[PDB]
Amino acid sequence: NSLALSLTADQMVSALLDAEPPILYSEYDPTRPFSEASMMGLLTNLADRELVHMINWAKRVPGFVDLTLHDQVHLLECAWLEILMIGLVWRSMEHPGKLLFAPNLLLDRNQGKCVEGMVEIFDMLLATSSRFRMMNLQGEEFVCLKSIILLNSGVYTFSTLKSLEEKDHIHRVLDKITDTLIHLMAKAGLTLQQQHQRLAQLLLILSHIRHMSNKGMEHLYSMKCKNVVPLSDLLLEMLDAHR
């Protein structure tokens, strides 16, 4: 018996909106330009503090608590950077050409060259943010996509007859979020053709978010070996799950 399967479309959006994590500040001090090691320090420190809120956000995502602890660990390990990236891209919608990592940390692609190799990932994140702007992505749609990422990115990486009912339970919650997304677009006055098209457009962006997370995960492991910036113990464990 799961209360997630019993939620209505509006109750689904309400639960997700109420579970939104806070927008954290960085330690950025504009008095002195930062180095590659210190700019990455701000980024990795910010991500580490966000992971704590993401974990407590994931529990409030309907259906996530019904999963086993090892499955919750697996989903977060596989999805954590995707969830950070879509949040960054969402915050940056109203700031063309810039990435709003924190309210006190708004970076253009020129300043992103301070970190070696971080330039290509910077343009990809900007293009995703520009795509959300061109589509006029709604906050109700955004919280749906972020929950899909949590549940979907690790579902195809899981044996017994008892593993199917939990695997099927995730696809049931995923189906519920799909119904919720269509419900939102039908309210906005879109035809059935426009609803299906917008639904497809949103999900195809998740393919690019996975791509950005893959490249970002490899770049995060690069500086880990280079011993450049101190990485937190949780961030290292998140990084070791992919390697």
Ligand X SMILES: COc1ccc(C[C@H]2C[C@H]3[C@@H]4CCc5cc(O)ccc5[C@H]4CC[C@]3(C)[C@H]2O)cc1
- Burial (CB < 10 A; 0-12, 13-18, 19+), residue 142, is buried
Q: Are 212 and 85 in contact (CB under 8 A)?
A: yes
- The whole-angstrom separation of Cα 222 and Cα 117 is 10
Per-residue x/- track, 32-51, ligand X (CB under 6 A): -----------xx-xx--x-
- The whole-angstrom separation of Cα 243 and Cα 240 is 5
Select 44 or 129, whichever has its Cβ closest to ligand X: 44
Select 144 or 223, whichever has its Cβ closest to ligand X: 223
For the chain, give me the number of helices (H) and strands (E)? 8, 2
User: Minimum CB separation from ligand X for residue 83, in Å?
Assistant: 9
Hey, which residues between 103 and 122 contact ligand X (CB under 6 A)?
118, 121
Q: Which stretch binds a copy of itself (CB under 8 A): 37-45, 61-69, 99-107, 119-127?
A: 119-127
Known binding residue 219? Answer is yes
Select 180 or 213, whichever has its Cβ closest to ligand X: 213
CB atoms within 10 A of CB 109: 15
Q: Which does 216 bind (CB under 5 to 8 A by kind): other proteins, ligand X, a copy of itself, none?
A: ligand X
Query: Which residues make up the interface to other proteins (CB under 8 A)?
Result: 52, 55-56, 58-59, 69-70, 72-73, 76-77, 233-234, 237-238
Find where tokens 């990115």 sit.
Answer: 153
